[PDB]
């Protein structure tokens, strides 16, 4: 399952190959020196020894031929490992970085990648040093068709182009733009709020500590700003530059954290646009440069596209765009919406929805909840291939409703985070359930039994219980749900308190709590025990329902008032 | 009732007197000129005419004697009016300015005072001009015992000293220091919050527009800072200066509003103090100077002492100190507490308490509410002479309680402002009533009847209803009060809603609302009508009391449960 094992070996092999080369060049100059030594002492005037100086010559030429073969052999294996490193392992990191940012499983450490990039780079610069001591031996001693001279140039050019792009691709945004004051929603930034972003260089060469300075550019190289209509122009406030180093990081990595960076719009002084503000993407790019003796390398990375918003109202709308982006696109195309947004497909939305909950809460969406939502978006066919347009997700109002899909679940999340967390996290809430299934689950259940479900018609995001009562005829019983509770109500008293002291009352009758067992036949106080709040007359504060027309209570008048309704509007 | 009528006349007389003087000096120089004219033409050589030039001489001397008498007569009436103006009318303004700032009736306009100060000052400078044209005539023509020369110096010195202190006393703080973000609580300022203060000069002389610049000094000339132990040292942030003018004001007055002034403490780098922070007073003083041709006047006014606090928690505690100050002291003594704070007396506290409500609300304390509070502080004797120590007001906890008096009423005010305003403002709340009177008012009342009273044991500040039920024996009925409601509860549902849907309930019994009539036999829904809030099952949210042991309801089991208590612990 790990191509890491083979990659470790290749770069091990790379390190192992440069080191023999270094060993063989030492004896190459060792013999180069005694050839000059012998050939010079013999010139200073039957023990021929000219047979030796002819052999010592051939060794030198063979040895030269050998290390030139060994270097090109190495440049050929390192071309193969970098292609893997840069074009597989690193590319896959970046995709699972955009999965992680929007709710996926956590990303691994950059450290395996950094370790790979590093010793490849460390080998790539030892070869540079070897190519240069070979040059020292070439002009101390050359001859016809010197294998040093015949490969000197393209060996030099091959190591650099490799080294150049290697560290060029090493320039990664380790942590994407993210307003700390809004931690769980990166890539969306509000004018006047500071955000942070951390760049990293994976090659980790001590020679580079405090030697690279990164500039931040907003909307660099914009054809879209003057092509697309009404594009908004912004500017970065803060230190636009920062120098990389290794002690600020705790892991010793070479990075440059732009803390305290903020964004404000231009003062151009309105126009219409085919792309609404949250649908409009920008990008934050970064530039640095490696000036060393004789060589110059230009580095340029870019963050994932960001959405900028005017006020916190636009936070959930914007985050839909982020999600649609990193769900589908893997490339920074700032026109991905335009008005060509791809429809997503349920097999992906299905679990990125599940992510929005496990990231916020400690519990994700289950299959039964996913079928519910599936049907709401697609229909009866719960097909993984199901195509979910972007308009049906955040633009057009869902089905026969007056609010879009995503915002309906954002505010459900809101509510769960702020009021329903331990209930939801313990799995007491069967919140995602159509009214059709809702009924069919309780139909053959004890009349004390209920279930908590989220309302599909509350824009502000509410929860409600549904219970079943018997209805003259044994089959086709009576199904009741209370008006669902928004945060306004649960701020005043928690849902577990509401459930326990709920009363159905009626003029001149005993109140009684309809709710007796939660769905799998579990007693109310045994189910919601741990979630309860727990000289004058004490007073408590409770939700109640007056029906307004054991012994006869108010649910006995509830039963009668609804059969009278059912016995009315009968056919004849 | 108005000494204004006589004052208007005196300063009218003052203006009327300078104007005849100006008329008489014109003919004084008119005749001075023809005396020189005749006496010179006669010198240029039986129609004596030396009889004329002897008479014209006597007129001049008499006229001179006359305007010197008329000026000293005026300087004598203006000494009398300024003493009134500066030492009565203005002093009384300043006392009713400190009454107004802390809840008294609104203060009048400075405009009558400004008009007085002005024409007195305008007269005082026309006299200066007259004293100077007299000087012009003196050296054109003098002689033995010239009445001009014999009074010239002290006339000059009398007009200036008068003019000097006149405008010196004209330097008033028109609007006291007051954090706008805390409007109803001036003289208390929090470090880092801007406050405003407006100085005014009442003399209103166009010559002075944009010609006076006022500096603000904090704690100027402090013997107390190094005498009293642990005194805190602060500093003003902002423009410390500002120039007076007349167009910034809308009434055309000469004033200098220090907007955007703020305060921060020193960085001396803890000690103990006999005076706690809110008990510690400071003062903000102001300096300006009148540099005109030949004369220099130094002006120095001071605001009422201010309390500085670290955070809004100290706002109600500090305001007690302000109140105790401007209730008793009329002079800016910054040690008024020290540990010699005077006891206030009920005849004053009584209505300054009533002020705290009519300033906040639209309704003050009534006699019945005042007797209540009187008794709580003093006792059975409701004497106006009653001495109320400062310790019993904000320092030591009231009676057998764990909280001080004043803060108990601040949080009642808080509650009324934030939850009970229209109830309180319509006089539906009999909130100030001991339990003893509370009972004795309902004893002979219908059993549906109740009354709303403030709890005397709620530090956070709560309201509750008390109703009466019949109790086997007709006399000595049953008195019930619910645990009183803090703001936590009334945020969730308003008190009028709580009252209407209040239910006493009990296991297997009908609920019923005990509350049927408010005290003067007024039906619940007819009393609290206007204050009510007014496909699932609807739900509402209501306060209830389970007694936990027409037809038999839950107040019938309430009645039985309390006689069983009363029938228990009986004597034998």
- Give the whole-angstrom CA distance, residue B36 versus residue B56: 10
- Give the whole-angstrom CA distance, residue A35 versus residue A162: 35
Largest CA distance in chain B: 138
- Give the whole-angstrom CA distance, residue A467 versus residue A451: 7
Does residue B481 sit at the A interface (CB-CB below 8 Å)? yes
Chain A residues in contact with B505 (beta carbon < 8 A): 511
**A483/B551 touch (CB, cutoff 8 Å), yes or no:** no
- Give the whole-angstrom CA distance, residue B181 versus residue A495: 38
**Type and span of the H or E element at B567:** helix B554-567
Instruction: Find out whether B244 and B214 touch, Cβ atoms under 8 Å.
Output: yes
Tell me how crowded residue B151 is: count the other CB atoms within 10 A of its CB.
18
Token pair for A501 = 């002291």
Instruction: Find out whether A438 and A347 touch, Cβ atoms under 8 Å.
Output: no
Token pair for A461 = 């995001």
**Three-class secondary structure assignment of B269-291:** CCCCCCCCHHHCCECEEEEEEEE
Least Cα distance to B454 among B495, B512, B492 occurs for: B495
Chain B residues in contact with A539 (beta carbon < 8 A): 482-483, 485, 543-545
CB under 8 Å to A231, separation ≥6 — which residues? A222, A224, A225, A273, A280
The sheet with strand B540-546 has its strands ordered as A503-505, A540-546, B540-546, B503-505
Instruction: List, in sequence order, every residue forming a beta bridge with A546; answer none if it has no partner.
Output: A505
Least Cα distance to A299 among A486, A171, A437 occurs for: A171
Please name the residue ranges forming H helices in B44-110: 50-84, 90-102
Least Cα distance to B169 among B198, B128, B197, B201 occurs for: B201
Residue A538 is nearest to which of B511, B545, B551, comparing CB atoms?
Answer: B545
Q: What is the resolution of the experimental data for this entry, in Å? A: 3.0
Phi/psi of residue A382, nearest 5 degrees: -85, 45
- Give the whole-angstrom CA distance, residue B330 versus residue A406: 66
In the PDB record, what is the listed experimental method?
X-ray
End-to-end CA separation in angstroms for chain A: 70
Q: How far is CA A508 from the centre of its chain?
A: 59
Instruction: Find out whether B445 and B521 touch, Cβ atoms under 8 Å.
Output: yes
- Give the whole-angstrom CA distance, residue A279 versus residue A230: 12
Instruction: List, in sequence order, every residue forming a beta bridge with B345; answer none if it has no partner.
Output: B387
- Give the whole-angstrom CA distance, residue A422 versus residue A425: 5
DSSP B245: B
Token pair for A165 = 């792009």
Chain A residues in contact with B484 (beta carbon < 8 A): 536
- Give the whole-angstrom CA distance, residue B198 versus residue B194: 14
DSSP B304: P
Block residue for tokens 């004369």: B295
SS3 category, A571: coil
Least Cα distance to B511 among A410, A510, A202 occurs for: A510
End-to-end CA separation in angstroms for chain B: 70
Least Cα distance to B447 among B390, B514, B512 occurs for: B514
Nearest-CA distance A562 → chain B (Å): 12
CB under 8 Å to A250, separation ≥6 — which residues? none
Breaks, C-N > 2.5 A, in chain B lie after: 45, 269, 534, 549
Instruction: List, in sequence order, every residue forming a beta bridge with B443; answer none if it has no partner.
Output: none
SS3 category, A129: helix
Nearest-CA distance A512 → chain B (Å): 9
Tell me how crowded residue B42 is: count the other CB atoms within 10 A of its CB.
12
Instruction: Find out whether B464 and B482 touch, Cβ atoms under 8 Å.
Output: yes
- Give the whole-angstrom CA distance, residue A270 versus residue B103: 50
Instruction: List, in sequence order, every residue forming a beta bridge with A261; answer none if it has no partner.
Output: A195
Instruction: Find out whether B470 and B477 touch, Cβ atoms under 8 Å.
Output: yes
Does residue B72 sit at the A interface (CB-CB below 8 Å)? no
Residue A542 is nearest to which of B482, B544, B547, comparing CB atoms?
Answer: B544
Chain A residues in contact with B495 (beta carbon < 8 A): none
Does residue A491 sit at the B interface (CB-CB below 8 Å)? yes
Does residue B511 sit at the A interface (CB-CB below 8 Å)? yes
Nearest-CA distance A507 → chain B (Å): 8
SS3 category, B398: coil
Please name the residue ranges forming H helices in A85-214: 90-102, 111-140, 147-168
Q: Count CA atoms closer than 13 A to B278's CA, side-chain side.
A: 18
Does residue B536 sit at the A interface (CB-CB below 8 Å)? yes
Token pair for B315 = 């706002």
Block residue for tokens 């003087």: B21
Give one DSSP letter per residue of B535-548, joined into a string.
Answer: --B--EEEEEEE--
Sign of CA dihedral A291, A292, A298, A304: negative
Does residue B544 sit at the A interface (CB-CB below 8 Å)? yes
Does residue B492 sit at the A interface (CB-CB below 8 Å)? yes
Does residue A34 sit at the B interface (CB-CB below 8 Å)? no
Dihedral class, residue B395 (left if φ above 0, else alpha if ψ from -120 to 50, else beta): alpha
Q: Environment class of residue A330 by beta-carbon count within 10 Å: exposed (0-12), middle (13-18) or buried (19+)? A: exposed
Tell me how crowded residue B516 is: count the other CB atoms within 10 A of its CB.
17
**Three-class secondary structure assignment of A498-567:** HHHHCEEECCCCECECCCCEECCCEEHHHHCCCCCCCCCECCEEEEEEECCCCCCEHHHHHHHHHHHHHH
Dihedral class, residue A47 (left if φ above 0, else alpha if ψ from -120 to 50, else beta): left
Nearest-CA distance A445 → chain B (Å): 21
The sheet with strand A284-292 has its strands ordered as A241-243, A213-218, A284-292, A295-302
Which of residues 251 through 270 in chain A touch B, CB cutoff 8 A? none
For chain B, how big is the Rg over CA atoms in Å?
Answer: 36
Block residue for tokens 């019938």: B556
Please name the residue ranges forming H helices in B141-212: 147-168
Instruction: Find out whether B66 and B24 touch, Cβ atoms under 8 Å.
Output: yes
Chain B residues in contact with A482 (beta carbon < 8 A): 536-537, 539
Token pair for B44 = 């240029």
Token pair for A72 = 């090109």
Token pair for A390 = 């972007």
Least Cα distance to B234 among B219, B244, B245 occurs for: B219
**B539/A536 touch (CB, cutoff 8 Å), yes or no:** no
CATH code of domain A3-171: 1.20.1050.20
Phi/psi of residue A128, nearest 5 degrees: -55, -40
- Give the whole-angstrom CA distance, residue B209 versus residue A397: 65
In A239-283, at which residue ranges do the beta strands (DSSP E only) sit? Answer: 241-243, 254-265
Instruction: Find out whether A148 and A138 touch, Cβ atoms under 8 Å.
Output: yes
Chain B residues in contact with A464 (beta carbon < 8 A): 536
Largest CA distance in chain A: 138
Q: Environment class of residue B333 by beta-carbon count within 10 Å: exposed (0-12), middle (13-18) or buried (19+)? A: middle
**Type and span of the H or E element at B187:** none
Sign of CA dihedral B494, B499, B500, B501: positive
Question: If you count DSSP H runs as helices and E runs as strands, how many of each does chain B have, helices first?
Answer: 16, 19
- Give the whole-angstrom CA distance, residue B458 versus residue B316: 16
- Give the whole-angstrom CA distance, residue B62 versus residue B458: 84
Chain A residues in contact with B542 (beta carbon < 8 A): 541-544
Token pair for B192 = 């880092």
Phi/psi of residue A334, nearest 5 degrees: -80, 5
Least Cα distance to B484 among B506, B503, B459 occurs for: B459
Instruction: Find out whether B53 and B38 touch, Cβ atoms under 8 Å.
Output: yes
Instruction: Find out whether A490 and A458 touch, Cβ atoms under 8 Å.
Output: no
- With CA atoms as reference, the chain A residue closest to B539 would be A545
**A508/B508 touch (CB, cutoff 8 Å), yes or no:** no
Give one DSSP letter per residue of B483-514, joined into a string.
Answer: PPB-HHHHHHS-HHHHHHH-EEE-TTSB-B-S
């Amino acid at each position: 399952l790990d191509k890491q094992k083979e990659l470790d070996s290749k770069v091990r092999n790379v390190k192992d190959k440069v080191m023999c080369i270094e060993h063989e060049i030492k004896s190459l100059e060792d013999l180069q020196d005694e050839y000059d030594f012998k050939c010079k002492t013999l010139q200073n005037r039957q023990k021929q020894e000219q047979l030796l100086l002819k052999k010592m010559y051939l060794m030198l030429d063979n040895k030269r031929k050998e290390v030139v073969h060994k270097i090109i052999e190495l440049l050929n294996v390192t071309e193969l490992t970098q292609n893997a490193l840069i074009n597989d392992e690193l590319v896959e990191w970046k995709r699972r970085q955009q999965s992680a940012c929007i709710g996926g499983p956590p990303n691994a450490c950059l450290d395996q990648l950094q370790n790979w990039f590093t010793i490849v780079a460390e080998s790539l610069q030892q070869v540079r040093q070897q190519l240069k001591k070979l040059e020292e031996l070439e002009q101390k001693y050359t001859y016809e068709h010197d294998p040093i001279t015949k490969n000197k140039q393209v060996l030099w050019d091959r190591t650099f182009s490799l080294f150049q792009q290697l560290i060029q691709s090493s320039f990664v945004v380790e942590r994407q733009p993210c307003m700390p004051t809004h931690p769980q929603r990166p890539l969306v930034l509000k004018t006047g709020v500071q955000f942070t972003v951390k760049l990293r260089l994976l090659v980790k060469l001590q020679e580079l500590n405090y030697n690279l300075k990164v500039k931040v550019l907003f909307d660099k190289d914009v054809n879209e700003r003057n092509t697309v209509k009404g594009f908004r122009k912004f500017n970065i406030l803060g230190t636009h530059t920062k120098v990389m180093n290794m002690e600020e990081s705790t892991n010793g990595s070479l990075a440059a954290e732009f803390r305290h960076l903020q964004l404000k719009e231009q003062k151009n002084a309105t126009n219409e646009g085919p792309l609404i503000v949250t649908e409009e993407l920008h990008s934050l790019s970064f530039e640095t440069q490696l000036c060393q003796p004789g060589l110059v390398i230009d580095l340029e990375t870019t963050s994932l596209p960001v959405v900028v918003i005017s006020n916190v109202s636009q936070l959930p709308s914007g985050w839909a765009s982020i999600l649609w982006y990193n769900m589908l696109v893997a490339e920074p195309r700032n026109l991905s919406f335009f008005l060509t947004p791809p429809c997503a497909r349920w097999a992906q939305l299905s679990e990125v929805l599940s992510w929005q909950f496990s990231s916020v809460t400690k519990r994700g969406l289950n299959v039964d909840q996913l079928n519910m939502l599936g049907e709401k978006l697609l229909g009866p066919n719960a097909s993984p291939d199901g195509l979910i347009p972007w308009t049906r997700f955040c633009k057009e109002n869902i089905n026969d409703k007056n609010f879009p899909f995503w915002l309906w679940i954002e505010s459900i999340l809101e509510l769960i985070k702020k009021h329903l967390l331990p209930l939801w996290n313990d799995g007491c809430i069967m919140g995602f359930i159509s009214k059709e299934r809702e009924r069919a689950l309780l139909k053959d259940q004890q009349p004390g039994t209920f279930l908590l479900r989220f309302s599909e018609s509350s824009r502000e995001g509410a929860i409600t219980f549904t219970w079943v009562e018997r209805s003259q005829n044994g089959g086709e019983p009576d199904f009741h749900a209370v008006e669902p509770y928004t945060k306004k109500e649960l701020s005043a008293v928690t849902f577990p308190d509401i459930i326990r002291n709920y009363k159905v009352m009626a003029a001149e009758n005993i109140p009684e709590n309809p709710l007796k067992y939660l769905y799998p036949n579990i007693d109310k106080d045994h189910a919601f025990g741990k979630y309860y709040s727990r000289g004058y007359i004490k007073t408590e504060l409770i939700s109640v329902s007056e029906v307004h027309s054991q012994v006869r209570t108010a649910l006995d008048v509830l039963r009668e008032l609804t059969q009278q309704a059912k016995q009315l509007r009968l056919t004849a």
